[PDB]
Amino acid sequence: STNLKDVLASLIPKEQARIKTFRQQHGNTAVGQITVDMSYGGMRGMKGLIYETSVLDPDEGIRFRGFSIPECQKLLPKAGGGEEPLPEGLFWLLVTGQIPTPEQVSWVSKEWAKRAALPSHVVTMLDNFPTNLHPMSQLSAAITALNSESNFARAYAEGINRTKYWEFVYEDAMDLIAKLPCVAAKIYRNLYRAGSSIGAIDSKLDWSHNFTNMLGYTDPQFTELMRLYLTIHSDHEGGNVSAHTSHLVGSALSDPYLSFAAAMNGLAGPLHGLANQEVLLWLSQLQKDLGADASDEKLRDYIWNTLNSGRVVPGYGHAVLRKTDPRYTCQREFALKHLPSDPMFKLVAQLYKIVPNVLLEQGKAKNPWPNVDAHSGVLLQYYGMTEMNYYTVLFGVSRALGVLAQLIWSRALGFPLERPKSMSTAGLEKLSAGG
Amino acid sequence: STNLKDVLASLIPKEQARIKTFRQQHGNTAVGQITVDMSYGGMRGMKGLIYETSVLDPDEGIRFRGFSIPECQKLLPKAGGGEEPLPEGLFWLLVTGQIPTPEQVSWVSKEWAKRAALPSHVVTMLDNFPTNLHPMSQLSAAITALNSESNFARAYAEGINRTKYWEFVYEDAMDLIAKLPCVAAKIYRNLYRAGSSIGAIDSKLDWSHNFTNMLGYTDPQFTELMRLYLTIHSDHEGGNVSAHTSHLVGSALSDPYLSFAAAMNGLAGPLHGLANQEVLLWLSQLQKDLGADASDEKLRDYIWNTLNSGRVVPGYGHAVLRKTDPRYTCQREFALKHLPSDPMFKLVAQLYKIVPNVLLEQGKAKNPWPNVDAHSGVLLQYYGMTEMNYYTVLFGVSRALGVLAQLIWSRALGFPLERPKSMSTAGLEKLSAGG
Ligand SMILES: CC(C)(COP(=O)(O)OP(=O)(O)OC[C@H]1O[C@@H](n2cnc3c(N)ncnc32)[C@H](O)[C@@H]1OP(=O)(O)O)[C@@H](O)C(=O)NCCC(=O)NCC[C@H](F)C(=O)O
Ligand SMILES: CC(C)(COP(=O)(O)OP(=O)(O)OC[C@H]1O[C@@H](n2cnc3c(N)ncnc32)[C@H](O)[C@@H]1OP(=O)(O)O)[C@@H](O)C(=O)NCCC(=O)NCC[C@H](F)C(=O)O
Ligand SMILES: O=C([O-])CC(=O)C(=O)O
Ligand SMILES: O=C([O-])CC(=O)C(=O)O
Helix, strand or coil, rough: CHHHHHHHHHHHHHHHHHHHHHHHHHHCCEEEEEHHHHHHCCCCCCCEEECCCCCCCEECEEEEHHHHHHHHHHCCCCCCCCCEEEEHHHHHHHHCCCCCCCCHHHHHHHHHHHHHCCCCCHHHHHHHHCCCHHHHHHHHHHHHHHHCHHHHHHHHCCCHHHHHHHHHHHHHHHHHHHHHHHHHHHHHHHHHHCCCCCCCCCCCCCCCHHHHHHHHCCHHHHHHHHHEEEEEEHCCCCCHHHHHHHHHHHHCCCCCHHHHHHHHHHHHHCCCCHHHHHHHHHHHHHHHHHCCCCCHHHHHHHHHHHHCCCCCCCCEEECCCCCCCHHHHHHHHHHHHHHCHHHHHHHHHHHHHHHHHHHHCCCCCCCCCCCHHHHHHEEEEEECCHHHHHHHHHHHHHHHHHHHHHHHHHHHCCCCCCCEEEEEEHHHHHHCCCC | CHHHHHHHHHHHHHHHHHHHHHHHHCCCCEEEEEEEEHHHHHHHHHEEEECEEEEECCCCEEEECCHHHHHHHHCCCEEECCCCCCCCHHHHHHHHCCCCCHHHCCCHHHHHHHHHHHHHHHHHHHCCCCCCHHHHHHHHHHHHHHHCCCCCHHHHHHHHCCHHHHHHHHHHHHHHHHHHHHHHHHHHHHHHCCCCCCCCCCCCCCCCHHHHHCCCCCHHHHHHHHHHHHHCCCCCCCCCCCHHHHHHHHHHCHHHHHHHHHHHHHHHHCCCCCHHHHHHHHHHHHHHHHCCCCCCCHHHHHHHHHHHHHHHHHHEECCCCCHHHHHHHHHHHHHHCCCCCCCCHHHHHHHHHHHHCCCCCCCCCCCCCCCHHHHHHHHHHHCCCCCCHHHHHHHHHHHHHHHHHHHHHHCCCCCCCCEEEEEEEHHHHHHHHHC
């Protein structure tokens, strides 16, 4: 009865037409200019790509197919007796642009439970990895190794006509989303619960619930946290490092496993998703140097020392957001409801009152407000997940939802190879005169 | 006596100053405009990044720090009794912008022989990989796994001041270039020469020679081919998929191993470096369907069938080049000198006379000329390297030279996070009115 793939078959041709006519009329219309500073500045401010699933507003934050987080919290189906949106529903919304029914949501859940299975070669590799190999590197290498199962890679090799690329990307997308939690849980168990097993998938539970059972957590509030976590970290428009990386690699026709693994190596950078781990390590040294209940003057001193040492304060600032990240606010609200007296939470709350002021004083950051990473690990630690080097993996698992949803669309719409022109400083000086 | 790292310490501050003043005067100067079609078109034609090591001219082809291939062939040091440039010398040129002395070239060779050593966990993983896991995926997963040895990742974790990032990237760069051949050779042996060993590095030979000995080839002309291959596939400006991917991932502060592995997943796409493999598989089906000596009318029929089936003709076309790739010409010249009567070479020669005409007739490709991938595998096969699924790995090994040379510069110059703005089709229609 429900079949996302049939839904997409009807949607595709209409969007193709719509874009075709638009470009007929406005393809040559200019939407912006490029300056020397934008080239030197990591394209800051350049409108450079088309990404359909989500769009970020610098002041208001992210919108998923038009809906803000509060709107999704309210509109998306929840688990029986739950309060947090199921990420399965967020995936349907991103892919079709429509709010799904609970019936449609449970179909996603069953499809993902049905497709979760790991090949033995991947299992062996994980089991043979050393404990000092970072969890994100373990994750990226296992996803890369899963490419032997690519249905897209296989069809490509068989000579499939380019109009059908999307059909195979969709299959690999749903299979990869299905498998992610098993891969991530195996790493968690191997590194931190040596000698135990992730167990089996219960075709009757939602994806987050099977995931938390494989991680070994029993707390029902923890399952709720996971549902929220996985929904909010899902997508953040196209220009963020991880999504842009999957887009660019996928543009060369690399399969979704290869495209997502490359995205993960970008999410592991300290300036991107690894900041969620970095924030906890910074907080831990904080409480260690200053000891648990610190005065504001001491917290200020501590922030200054980081700044003065040529380092960034993790969890603050953004390439596009100009105000407090709504994903940060959504997390604060969850804390206030569930762990209002936690001391670390209290520390995170206190820093909100101080860091922005110090960053403003310093005068270098354009956005002195916190980002999503400043409040995520605090929530995790409270429920017993204290392994901070593992935090980015959860972000990686959520990120698959958005990037894979767009990936299907990129191929459905025929987007070509991402290939801009580069310039040397010498060549650019000549182009203008020099300076 | 020779120490590239000391050379770079003098160069860095001067380039920093030069760029600083230039941007003081022209940062706001506009170098171009962005149109709707460029956004939908994978940024085609957009000047979007600064990349110092090489610059591609659409008509003339690539220049490495100002020198064309014929110029490098002529200026770069060669092996004793050799004719082809040593890739070690090309690396010095890319990194310093100056033609090195043979003395300087041998220092690179010894440094790379000194740093080649693989950790056991990487050795075990390779040895446990199944034979149906593509060589590029085996390569990318092993590079990812090597990140546990990252000196940059380590310094970052220790809180190093950002001004010293380049020093650690340089170390990881030289270590990674050193190790590449051992990793690539282990894959070659495991897959195609099961039960044999790559052997050991001879500190007295050039990098290409140790590499060919580890692959198990004895032919001296083959060593010469390798030197040329590795030099020409080294860099191709910054906007190509592989280089842009390393740039973008590295921009997040991910270590060079993570940045290069993500680059490799982009090089494995069929529209990028995997085309070198694709060309041989297409040629093999050709000679199989039509049988060895084909008439031009039959070759035309065969090209048309590919085009009509919704597929690309591998090895032809380019995102930027508008004329025959000089890397193709450089390869043709090598063939004419060394294997002029090879039947496959003859087929490749014959297609040069036909494919461009058919592509022009079809009217879709902007560049109907051949690219580097159309002539590389032909050379390999002639010397006995007939394992076509392994071809892209050699391109991967060469590519490390250019991307890693720029990576050091990106960090030395303080380039920030690559983060452009994305737009949805709906949001863009509104920005203009719609269509
Ligand atoms: C997010 C990030 C990379 C944005 O970079 P960018 O758009 O270049 O920032 P700005 O334009 O504000 O940078 C202007 C200057 O302020 C500095 N600055 C910005 N944010 C800073 C911070 N948190 N701490 C210290 N200095 C900071 C910049 O490093 C830059 O200094 P420079 O001129 O000497 O290079 C930057 O704010 C940062 O480093 N933040 C800390 C790391 C972080 O939290 N990353 C996670 C963010 C996100 F949520 C994600 O998970 O992806
Ligand atoms: C190189 C590549 C991706 C450039 O793409 P792009 O800049 O988008 O090409 P164009 O602007 O010329 O594309 C215009 C149209 O011509 C088609 N076309 C271009 N080259 C073609 C080819 N070799 N065979 C068939 N159709 C081709 C394009 O696919 C596109 O059709 P579409 O409108 O229906 O999408 C394209 O030429 C191609 O697919 N070539 C074949 C694959 C290949 O050889 N890759 C290796 C190239 C390089 F050397 C490398 O190794 O990285
Ligand atoms: O938007 C960005 O650049 C980074 C970010 O917050 C995300 O990827 O979630
Ligand atoms: O220049 C490009 O876009 C691709 C290419 O030829 C290379 O990366 O060598």
